[PDB]
Amino acid sequence: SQKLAAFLAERTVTSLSEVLSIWKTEILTKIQQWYLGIEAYTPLKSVIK
Amino acid sequence: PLMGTVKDARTELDTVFQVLLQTYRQIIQQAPNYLKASLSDRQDHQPFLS
Amino acid sequence: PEYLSISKQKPDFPPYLNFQTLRDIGITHLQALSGKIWTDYNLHDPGVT
Amino acid sequence: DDESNAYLGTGWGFPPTFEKKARSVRLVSAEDDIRESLQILLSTNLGERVMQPNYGCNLQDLLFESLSPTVASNIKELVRTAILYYEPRIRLNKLDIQQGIVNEADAQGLIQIIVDCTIISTNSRFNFVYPFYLQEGS
């Protein structure tokens, strides 16, 4: 929310890049690390994927 | 969205964020139901942890 | 002097404060968790210490 | 799984070793699990375990003495009693004790004790190896 408000204040490339880096580093990387850190003897392994 | 009405610029970003957050929340919510089975299903845990 | 003679229950303490009960519960849980790899439970084993 | 010598058991090594690339603690088995056992028993004094006042062996009570026959017999009695009570998996053959011989001045101050043992081919009712002792008894 903070990053989106800061972008909507002034629309340039750097604000957009920060908004995108939020998504890249706070959601998707962590889903990947969660997936690789689990073994197949639990059902969660098949849920996430 | 750097070439259109500030609303169109708003809608696109919210539209992507909503899907990402839905999946994130689903995983977080379902996780707590497997902790005890992850323990009681084996007899070959590392001793320094058990 | 309040106590002129003592017993196993005079002064009295809650029944969970018993070294042998705690030790037996610990050993049972250890065998349930890792009894397939760590099988030696004699007194020389550092884990019992 | 039922391998060979499973009845002799596996356990922690001495001293404890931790590996970091392989996220585990070192474990010994069979004959190594027995040898290390001895190293513990003869290096602990009688009062050092918290609720086990009878576990140990008081060898350092015989330091600063010459090796007379009455000292050798006492060493032998102590070692035999400790092994009889706390090592059911082996059979002790003989004890060899010598003083002297290196410098013939440094050699005079040390005592050497040799322990000869063999491993019994049967199980024992006093061996706490899982899960046999739940049925083999006490």
Residue A49 burial by CB count (10 A; 0-12/13-18/19+): exposed, middle or buried? exposed
Closest approach of A22 to chain B, Cα-based (Å): 10
Taking only residues 10 to 49 of chain B, the set having a beta carbon closer than 8 angstroms to any beta carbon of chain C reads: 39, 43-47
CA distances from C36 to B4, D7, D34, D109 (A): 65, 13, 20, 48
Contacts of A12 (CB under 8 A, 6+ apart): B2
Neighbour subunits, C (≥3 Cβ pairs < 8 A): B, D
Chains C and A touch (3+ CB pairs under 8 A): no
8 Å CB contact between D34 and D90: yes
> Which structure tokens are listed for A3?
């990053």
What was the structure determination method? cryo-EM
Q: What is the dihedral of CA A12, A18, A22, A23, to 10 degrees?
A: 50
Phi, psi of D115 (to 5 degrees): -110, 120
How far is it, in rounded angstroms, from Cα C43 to Cα C27?
Answer: 12
Probe site for chain A from B20, B26, B45 (most A CB atoms < 10 A): B20
Q: Does C32 touch chain D (CB under 8 A)?
A: no
Long-range contacts of A6-12 (CB under 8 A, 24+ apart): A8/B6, A8/B9, A8/B10, A11/B1, A11/B2, A11/B6, A11/B9, A12/B2
Closest approach of B36 to chain D, Cα-based (Å): 22
Of D115, D121, D77, nearest in space to D97 by CA: D115
Could you tell me the resolution of this structure in angstroms?
A: 3.2
Probe site for chain B from C38, C40, C41, C48 (most B CB atoms < 10 A): C38
- State the first-to-last Cα distance of chain B, in angstroms, to the nearest integer: 54
